[PDB]
Design a protein around this ligand. Structure first.
Ligand code: FMN
Length: 151
């Protein structure tokens, strides 16, 4: 049973070094996800995250349980889990997308004046996931593998 799981979270503003945290998150995500057959997308803007995970239900659920404990974010808002009809984010172990004009236009047109994904509801994910799929990935210059960031 392949599923898609989506959540939004607040970035832990206590962590001053955002750039190192984002590079560390993507290094860890891409290595673990590639090994465990998970793909998806991570959006960051306005001190908040949106993530979608795709893959085998048990692995996705165990990964989400781990992410919920991560020091780097808090106030996790679980949006949905559902059986996948197509593997939309197959191309990325973990795609990274930041604020772009299409996403800013989406938020403003529905009456939000911030781009914080905690403001999204499940119906918005129709348009928002499509925007994350078509967005140019944001390049972040991450070390080649997770072993390089520890010991
Ligand atoms: C916003 C956010 C997204 C994350 N996404 C992933 C992910 O997709 N895959 C992954 O393995 N870890 C992800 N992590 C990292 C995990 O929370 C955790 O640091 C990593 O799995 C290492 O766990 P360990 O302490 O058991 O080695 C994410 C963390 C944050 C804050």
């Amino acid at each position: 049973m392949n599923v898609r799981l989506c959540y939004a979270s607040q970035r832990n503003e206590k962590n001053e070094d955002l750039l190192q945290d984002l590079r560390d998150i993507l290094t860890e995500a891409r290595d673990f996800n590639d090994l465990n057959g998970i793909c998806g997308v991570l959006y960051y803007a306005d001190n908040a995250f949106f993530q979608c995970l795709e893959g085998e239900q048990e692995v996705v659920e165990r990964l989400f349980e781990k992410i919920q404990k991560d020091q780097r974010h808090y106030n996790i808002k679980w949006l949905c889990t559902y059986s996948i009809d197509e593997h939309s984010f197959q191309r990325w172990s973990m795609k990274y997308v930041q604020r772009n004009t299409n996403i800013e236009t989406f938020f403003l047109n529905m009456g939000e004046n911030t781009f914080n994904p905690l403001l999204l509801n499940q119906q918005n994910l129709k348009f928002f996931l499509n925007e994350l799929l078509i967005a140019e990935q944001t390049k972040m210059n991450t070390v080649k593998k997770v072993g390089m960031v520890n010991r």
